[PDB]
């Protein structure tokens, strides 16, 4: 009697994606920031006034962002498209407007609409022009319908604000110190200040440490200062256990050693220990009330809640001092994800505060001593301050908020347009707070808390392994709630007030503490009933579905989380060994009677947090459901991310193989969108004949990657041929490459600017310099048109000019010097289009789109969607390629020796499924933890007449005799990578050198030479080739001849020593230029190296 299984259960994922998913997170965050958070910030800073000249004020009424507009026209707004912004290298922002009221000369004057700044509008947002548009309108606006969006366009470049991952605030963390002292820490962060206070047991007693105290003081003194002076009450609050009293005894003894017994004495001691920023007593009380533990509120200098909080902290420390139950930082249940909305809100608040301060300063400087003419803010309301601030913060990526003392870098990154998959995977990346500080390996390791939230296999391979992560296919990020009804329900559910009872009740085994966002909500008994009622109410809908509730029995604490940034995942509710969702509900969803919101409202599917699933039980499948089950997994394949979703049958391969496959798919070559022809980027790679994979995954169908594939399916035969596929290499077919297989197109952009300087002069394009001998343009200016601009359709060779630009040297007749834009390239390029635009600064921007059609050759890198990266080793002709009975020759021959060590059975399964699909005219599915089985494809093969194992009778093409072993033929989806041997080839002649040190440059684009690093020098030393090392590091790199005086040992010039004013003891000497520079720097540093020369004999 097997449990019935709902087959259409996977239909819950598309319905969820219809309203949430991959890119909806940033869109919703930006919409909330521009709709509610900006209004809240404006209301917080609504009124600003100056101390001098009272009765003067500036009141803000309502702020608007408007629709995206461009300031190109002469004081005229005009709708501008994101594609136009990309073409013109401008910003896609909307004018921020506000209505204000002020008093000029005590007469109230109001303004209904006044611009104050420009906010870069995110694409596909609420106010974006792309939203609510059909694909026809997208085509009219020159934008791809499948484009994920969610990124900003500033100065033509596409920047994406990555999701930052930090530790949860207002939470006690018990951990070992540097030397190994088990202590506690708490970082109380409110809307104004953020203070971290620690507590250590370095000498058996609890010392509290804060940044505002000269020296750490005992906790008992702080207890006595915070109102509670009875040692009995302090001990009862700490705990009533024998070991607790034994551990706390030293603290009581140390406190009794001193004469501190009253609140006044304790406050005096604290004030004496307070650092400079009874007066000392007042400062100590103020620090204890506001500075220390800011998250714990005090009604009116009532430190009861703070006393209970520190008592619970000390109790946790005492409990941890025994059994090593140390909390881990890598537990994602205590992590918070800050989307772009919160960052933009903080930045806007800081910029608005700075603008208000500047306006107040200007008023204080202008109003009292200017003139009887009454001053008003409108004459000094800076409209470019906010615009420039936002543009710089989005472009440079460095955020420096002084009001919060936050100095972050790398917040924004250039959106990688290598492929649609690359852009979609980069849009859903997560950066960590560590940012490669230490090779801890803790946060870099894969924690079990990442189940269903982040992709386990998707991680960049390199130094950033483990710090850069991607979200799962099905997940959500919560926002902030009001916390009103939550507190009301908690109070109504019988939660006793903490102030009503003493701390002795905290030591009982049945009394469980309840916390709310780090604040002690109170105490409770029989927490099972409380949790059950809270969950039932949340399912009913009276409480927000995103409010998480968790219970830890080791500490007896029930946490109620309602802050934003928490990761949640939908789960089907299971009650009494039967899920709530049934076949009838799935059929209704398929027909359209209900949706995911209806499922959420009907208590069928609910969102679970990491802390909530820590206590709740989840089932993978229906057959796994037992008596002790509360939820059911929707789909197992959703564990993988977007980049990992392309892997066909990933559960049959190795984890490093999947990681490498995701890393290479982030660079896979293919189409970007339907507007790739009109799109003009600095570097683009396209495929001539892209084909969708035969073995496509449900994730592929969801992300619509089949519409924009990034590879081709080729008849690959796994065998060894000619020994040119020794180590991961492959052999390509000459005829296949000739017939268009693997053909790629490289598009490069060359931009030129003709700007007007301060003087009334402008850069001009000169016509082609015709040769008077032949009455035709010279070889360099051959491709130029009549206007001096290269025309499309022609070919460009090396050292040829594209724009014959000439600029003045004055900034009487202007003197123009030529600075043409020469083309640096080994191979020829063809001009496809030449776009000419005019900016508001009368500057002419000219962009020429160069194209290069390259054929796969030796050295090109290829991937097979399984991390089996390879390089083209040899290109054998078709007659040399083997043939089967049907006459089919393999296009790619891969090394079978790479299968045993890598355990890539998934590649074989994908090949078999693809062969079956191309035989039966179907598309097999390689869904993770499922998909088409091997038996089905074997049956398809045996029905179509081919072998049930893929191996077929093949005859050798060279000798014409059959092979002793059968060859494994089949269609495999191979994708070409951007790594080209034509671009990676380098050869450096003498070339140029650096001004500071006369050595070759670094990069290849600047014609740089190779570096014989310290390891190379060590190898040469070990070999003992002294002459070779000398010729490498002195003769061929920085050879130079200096003049050294044999009397003083200093460096001369032209055989003359200025120090001694003589030239008899001066002699030439070979020396590296770097060594000469070192000697000069030492002489500047007053460390004079005196060289005593002598004969070589």
């Amino acid at each position: 009697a097997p449990i019935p299984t709902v087959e259409e259960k996977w239909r819950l994922l598309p319905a969820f994606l219809k309203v949430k998913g991959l890119v909806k997170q940033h869109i919703d965050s930006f919409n909330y920031f521009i709709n509610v958070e900006i209004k809240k910030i404006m209301k917080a800073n609504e009124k600003v006034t100056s101390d001098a000249d009272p009765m003067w004020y500036l009141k803000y009424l309502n702020i608007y962002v408007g629709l995206p507009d461009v300031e190109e026209s002469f004081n005229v707004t005009r709708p501008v498209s994101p594609h136009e912004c990309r073409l013109r290298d401008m910003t896609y922002s909307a004018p921020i407007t506000v209505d204000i009221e002020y008093t000029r000369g005590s007469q109230r004057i109001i303004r209904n609409a006044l611009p104050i700044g420009r906010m870069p509008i995110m694409l596909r947002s609420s106010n974006c022009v792309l939203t609510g548009k059909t694909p026809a309108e997208f085509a009219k606006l020159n934008e791809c319908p499948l484009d994920p969006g969610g990124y900003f366009i500033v100065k033509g470049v596409e920047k994406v604000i990555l999701i930052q991952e930090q530790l949860s605030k207002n939470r006690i963390i018990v951990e070992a110190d540097r030397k190994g002292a088990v202590g506690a820490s708490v970082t109380s962060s409110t809307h104004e200040k953020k203070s971290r206070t620690n507590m250590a047991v370095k000498q058996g007693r609890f010392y509290l440490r804060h940044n505002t105290l000269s020296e750490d003081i005992p906790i008992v003194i702080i207890f006595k200062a915070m109102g509670v002076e009875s040692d009995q009450e302090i001990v009862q609050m700490i705990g009533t256990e024998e070991h607790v009293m034994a551990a706390f005894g030293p603290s009581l003894e140390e406190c009794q050693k001193a004469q501190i017994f009253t609140q006044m004495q304790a406050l005096k001691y604290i004030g004496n220990k307070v650092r400079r920023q009874k007066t000392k007593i007042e400062e100590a009380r103020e620090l204890l009330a506001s500075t220390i533990l800011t998250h714990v509120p005090v009604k009116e200098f009532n430190f009861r809640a703070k006393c209970i909080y520190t008592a619970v902290m000390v109790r946790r420390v005492i409990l941890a001092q025994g059994d090593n139950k140390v909390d881990d930082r890598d537990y994602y249940g205590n992590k918070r994800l800050e989307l772009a909305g919160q960052l933009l809100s903080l930045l806007f608040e800081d910029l608005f505060k700075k603008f208000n301060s500047e306006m107040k300063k200007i008023a204080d400087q202008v109003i009292p001593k200017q003139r009887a003419a009454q001053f008003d803010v409108v004459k000094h309301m800076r409209q470019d301050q906010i615009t420039n601030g936002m543009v710089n913060a989005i472009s440079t990526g460095n955020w420096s908020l002084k009001r919060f003392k936050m100095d972050r870098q790398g917040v924004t990154q250039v959106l990688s347009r290598l492929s649609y998959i690359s852009a979609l995977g980069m849009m859903t990346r997560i950066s960590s707070q560590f940012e490669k500080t230490r090779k801890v390996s803790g946060p870099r390791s894969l924690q079990p808390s990442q189940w269903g939230m982040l992709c386990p296999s998707d991680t960049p391979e390199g130094e950033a392994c483990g710090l850069v992560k991607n979200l799962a296919l099905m997940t959500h990020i919560t926002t902030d709630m009001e916390d009103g009804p939550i507190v009301k329900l908690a109070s109504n559910l019988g939660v006793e007030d903490v102030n009503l009872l003493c701390g002795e009740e905290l030591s009982y085994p049945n009394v469980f503490l309840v916390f709310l966002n780090g604040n002690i909500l109170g105490v409770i008994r029989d927490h099972k009933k409380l949790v059950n009622t809270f969950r039932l109410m949340r399912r009913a809908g009276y409480i927000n579905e995103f409010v998480s509730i968790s219970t830890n029995l080791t500490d007896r604490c029930v946490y109620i989380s309602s802050d934003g940034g928490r990761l949640c995942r939908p789960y089907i509710i299971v009650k009494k060994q039967k899920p709530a969702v049934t076949n009838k509900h799935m059929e209704e969803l398929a027909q359209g009677y209900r949706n995911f919101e209806d499922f959420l409202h009907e208590s069928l599917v609910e969102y679970l947090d990491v802390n909530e699933e820590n206590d709740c039980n989840i089932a993978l499948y229906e057959h796994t459901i037992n008596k002790d089950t509360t939820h059911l997994e929707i789909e197992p394949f959703t564990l993988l991310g977007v980049c990992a979703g392309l892997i066909p049958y990933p559960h049959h391969n190795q984890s490093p193989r999947n990681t490498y496959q995701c890393a290479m798919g982030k660079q896979a070559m293919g189409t970007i969108g339907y507007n790739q022809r009109n799109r003009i980027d600095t570097l683009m790679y396209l495929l001539a004949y892209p084909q969708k994979p035969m073995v496509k995954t449900k994730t592929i169908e969801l992300i619509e990657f089949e519409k924009l594939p990034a590879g081709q399916n080729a008849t690959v035969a796994v065998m060894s041929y000619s020994g040119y596929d020794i180590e991961d290499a492959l052999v390509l077919n000459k005829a296949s490459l000739d017939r268009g297989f693997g053909r790629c197109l490289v598009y490069k952009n060359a931009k030129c600017t003709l700007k007007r300087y301060t003087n009334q002069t402008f850069d001009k394009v000169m016509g082609p310099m015709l040769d008077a001998a032949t009455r035709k343009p010279i070889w360099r200016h051959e491709i130029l048109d009549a206007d001096g601009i290269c025309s499309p359709g022609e070919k460009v060779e090396n050292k040829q000019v594209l724009v014959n630009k000439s600029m003045p040297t004055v900034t009487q007749q202007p003197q123009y010097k030529d600075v043409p834009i020469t083309y640096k390239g080994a191979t020829d390029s063809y001009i496809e289009k030449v776009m000419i635009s005019s900016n508001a600064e009368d500057a002419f921007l000219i962009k020429m789109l160069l194209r290069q059609t390259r054929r796969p050759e030796i050295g090109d890198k290829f991937s097979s969607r399984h991390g089996q990266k390879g390089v083209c080793g040899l290109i054998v002709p078709q007659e040399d390629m083997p043939f089967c009975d049907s006459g089919i020759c393999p296009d790619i021959i891969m090394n079978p020796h790479g299968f045993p060590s890598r355990m890539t059975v998934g590649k074989l399964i994908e090949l078999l499924a693809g062969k079956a699909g191309v035989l039966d005219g179907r598309f097999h599915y390689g869904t993770a933890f499922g998909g088409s089985k091997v038996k089905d494809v074997c049956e398809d093969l045996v029905r179509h007449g081919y072998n049930y194992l893929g191996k077929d009778y093949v005859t050798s093409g060279i000798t014409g005799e059959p092979l002793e072993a059968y060859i494994y033929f089949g269609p495999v989806y191979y994708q070409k990578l951007k790594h080209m041997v034509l671009d990676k080839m380098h050869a450096r002649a003498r070339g140029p050198r650096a001004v500071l040190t006369r050595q070759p440059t670094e990069g290849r684009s600047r014609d740089g030479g190779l570096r014989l690093g310290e390891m190379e020098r060590d190898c040469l030393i070990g070999y003992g080739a002294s002459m070779l090392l000398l010729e490498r590091l002195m003769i061929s790199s920085d050879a130079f001849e200096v003049d050294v005086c044999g009397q003083c040992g200093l460096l001369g010039y032209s055989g003359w020593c200025h120090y001694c004013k003589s030239s008899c003891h001066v002699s030439s000497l070979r020396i590296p230029y770097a060594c000469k520079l070192l000697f000069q720097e030492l002489q500047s540093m007053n460390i004079i190296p005196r060289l005593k020369l002598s004969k070589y004999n």
Binding site: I789, G793, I836, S837
Partner: protein, 46 residues
């Protein structure tokens, strides 16, 4: 010499001289492409 260009949305042949505000008639779009050359270009089928 009459220099000809093409609008980004109208796709109409517009003639403008040097040092002129880049614009197209019966519209206000400011994207102007250059027509393909009339010279003979040889391509290889390889």
């Amino acid at each position: 010499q009459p220099m000809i260009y093409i609008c980004g949305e109208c796709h109409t042949e517009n003639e403008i001289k040097s040092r002129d505000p880049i614009r197209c008639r019966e519209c206000g779009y400011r994207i102007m492409y250059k027509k393909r050359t009339k010279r003979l270009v040889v391509f290889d089928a390889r």
